[PDB]
Symmetry: C3
Subunit: 195 residues, 3 copies
Amino acid sequence: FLFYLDIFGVIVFALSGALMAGRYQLDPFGVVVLASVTAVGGGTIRDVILQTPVFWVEKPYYLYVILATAILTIVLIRQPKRIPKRFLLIADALGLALFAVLGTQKALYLGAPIPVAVVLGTITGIAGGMIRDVLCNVIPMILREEIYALAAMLGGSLFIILHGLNWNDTNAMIVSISAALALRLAAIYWHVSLP
Amino acid sequence: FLFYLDIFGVIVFALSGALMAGRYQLDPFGVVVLASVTAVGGGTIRDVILQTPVFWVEKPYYLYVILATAILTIVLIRQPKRIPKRFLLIADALGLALFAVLGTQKALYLGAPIPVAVVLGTITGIAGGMIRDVLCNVIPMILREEIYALAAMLGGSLFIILHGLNWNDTNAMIVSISAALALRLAAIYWHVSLP
Amino acid sequence: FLFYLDIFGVIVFALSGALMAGRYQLDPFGVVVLASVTAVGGGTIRDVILQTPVFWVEKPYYLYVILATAILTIVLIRQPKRIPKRFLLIADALGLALFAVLGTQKALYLGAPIPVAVVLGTITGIAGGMIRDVLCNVIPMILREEIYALAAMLGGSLFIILHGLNWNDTNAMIVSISAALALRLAAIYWHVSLP
């Protein structure tokens, strides 16, 4: 289960970085770099702060997952410059809800306290997109009007509450990922903003 | 003593990040993120390079300190968009002088050599503001005309000299923080620049 | 041999950062900061991810090497604002080819797998320039039309192939650095781009 959620979150963040590079008409190598930065960005910061081995260093198959996602994005998509902005936000939304819960879960079971685990979950979910946006000189997600970081904090905090209610990790994460994803997708499809 | 200087430097850097978010009319969650990035930014890089536990991971009360400073900045201040720029510089100035000395002191007593300890002190003082400025697409402090990094290098180097003269840490840091703060505040109140 | 290649790559990356600061007419302290960020940027990320001591923390003479390169750039060059852009690219090109091979070699002999070692080599070669470019609000190298990251991936991958063919490290790195440097210099002197 966890094995499949990590790969899916990595493919998803690599897809958002690969699409972002397609807007700039970059060559395939620039696409792989921008896709790799978004895929591992939040995870590397999370593992380093936790003093634990980095996930793609400990398991090199993540790198082949990123390269495969970037290469498929290059060949399967004709004109990436005219790609709609909704597909980029939906991509960043999936990895945001996933890694916000997985990051909190991984930190909690590594000994991190409750508030530290939630913070490390939000870092895993938003840091990869923040580095991607500053490299392309684009306004980061947290500075836009739509709800963003609230969805990340919601996923990690809901996992802690369900974990405290003695739910198993599988049911606690599924509800936490769905609640974080529903709030972010609603803020994208309906442009919901907070004052 | 050290316990109170760390909290004050964290409140101060969190205040500068919270005020910066107020200029962009961000929601409370975007304010907490930008305040947290500035508060822990330099400290996290310092502890990671030192291969020591991160301060807010080892002591979660720093996170509650950041959240309390960010929330108070949201409710106690009416219109943050029209806030004067002097209060932002004074905020960044306090955390700059504090963490430049505390970072050097923490590194030196963890086994870091003299030049490494001073470099780690300047990193602790300026890195948090650098990440805050690039996220908001604002020119970083080091690229502006007023004296900035010199005040950081001055605080850490003065601590080493006073420590070599067999001053206790309390008196060595108080003079080092004041000398670094006086130079930066003078460069803000009188716009002093270096050719 | 390795001792001389590390110093040369550090001097070279510190030179590119010092020249970049000269365009903005920064004071000497802002020059040292920007030169230090470019010199250690890729190396610090490489060592941190590898859970190994940072090179300039373990050996403080790198810091004196950076400060000496930055100071010499300040005094030996009259007008740095009118410095040609070719000298900046050639500077970043030398450190790119060097650290892409040295980073892969250092990671491989520290236990990192083949794909992890190559990724860590490319990170060591491009991360320092990426941080330098975003601080100055300049378009990063990977977003430009000329060949860049391909030269970094080429140096690290060629080292692995020659290492697999039972070449000693000295001959494997010399060919790997030259092949990566020739591709990048050709893309600078002739403005070669990839579609």
